[PDB]
Amino acid sequence: DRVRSITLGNSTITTQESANVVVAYGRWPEYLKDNEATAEDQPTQPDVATCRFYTLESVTWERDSPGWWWKFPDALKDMGLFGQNMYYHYLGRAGYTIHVQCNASKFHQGCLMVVCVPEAEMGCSQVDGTVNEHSLSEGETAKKFASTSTNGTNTVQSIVTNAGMGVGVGNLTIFPHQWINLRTNNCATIVMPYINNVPMDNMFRHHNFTLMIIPFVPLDYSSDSSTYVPITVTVAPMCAEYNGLRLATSL
């Protein structure tokens, strides 16, 4: 009951200590139907060159770590043919499978929350100011939450308790989420469908959802146990569609 296998394209993930799988709102990803479309040209569907697991770079979970976030898309814009299909079209559409891995021994302890937040609009550390995109995202590198109130210009207000959105961090369980409790499991898996108020959208302009990893119980260990404990993310697009082919944009 704890072993699982997931195959997509030419990639496969195995796990021996999984809890279950979260399907965001009971809805699996699927293609756009004819009585819900507005764009008229025939779309392209690569179907194995884009729908496969891509791995980002890892972060180091330390004894005093506030947490991390990524923005999707724009974290996969340099990933193979998914990124190339993003650069040549005006409209795109895709669901995702997210898989977070972190293993440790039976003498370690700690607890992480893994949550996906749709339309996570963030605020600036200067209240009479506006944010820029570098402070929101660094591609495949993670942004870091902070330990206290932040200051200075152009940075995002990132104290963990408010999650940078002006809410209580303990209520983020309203979104699709799982937990990694080091004594129970070593991986989390979330299946996210396409969620928007329009049927397709431009993938450079709009961040569809933010992935947050926040430790509630810090990492602890004793005399000569291993000190280096990394966390790794792996994401696979599903039912990917593109419309509006023209010359390649340049950021």
Binding site: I13, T14, Q16, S18, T55, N103, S222, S225, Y228, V229
Partner: protein
């Protein structure tokens, strides 16, 4: 290490080592020093042409209290070998989670423009490369050894075949009565 058992162990450890690559080698089942003296390699060196899929099994031989996850990736020919986990994640890969089951299989599928490749592989019939990276890292409690090792097994799938018999270059003599 060519005459010790250390030749068979792949080293891994705990701590922040994400930027370090675990291992990597070319896919040349009868040519590369890594594969040429195994069972599969020894059988292939009697032949000139081969074809089919190849299975690599990995086994974690650490303590029962150590946890970790790894990324195992195969890249097709046409580019240089990846230099980071972000590059390697774009090819055919699997994410291995260490647990009660100790072994994970990476299957290399036959992706080639010709029906057969040469056992004596050249640049025209190249087959790609394999690499391993830390997906999260190794975590252990107090009282456990920090360093661990991984072992790798190779075998052939049920679509595999060879042809064009020849003599092997591994045995030789300088006179009779040998």
């Amino acid at each position: 290490k060519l005459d010790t058992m250390e030749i068979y162990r792949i080293p891994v450890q705990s701590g922040n080592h994400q930027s370090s690559q675990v291992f990597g080698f070319q896919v040349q089942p009868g040519l590369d020093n890594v594969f040429k003296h195994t069972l599969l390699g020894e059988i292939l060196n009697y032949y000139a042409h081969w074809s089919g899929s190849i299975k690599l099994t990995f086994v974690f031989c650490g303590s029962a209290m150590a946890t970790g996850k790894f990324l195992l990736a195969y890249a097709p020919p046409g580019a240089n070998a990846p230099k980071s986990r972000k590059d390697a994640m774009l090819g055919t890969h699997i994410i291995w989670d260490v647990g009660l089951q100790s072994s994970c299989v990476l299957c290399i599928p036959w992706i080639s423009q010709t029906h057969y490749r040469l056992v004596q592989q050249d640049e025209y019939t190249s087959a790609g490369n394999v690499t391993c990276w830390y997906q999260t890292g190794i975590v252990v409690p107090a009282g456990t050894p920090t360093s661990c090792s991984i072992m790798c097994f190779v075998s052939a799938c049920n679509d595999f075949s060879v042809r064009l018999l020849k003599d092997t270059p591994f045995i030789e003599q300088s006179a009779l009565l040998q």
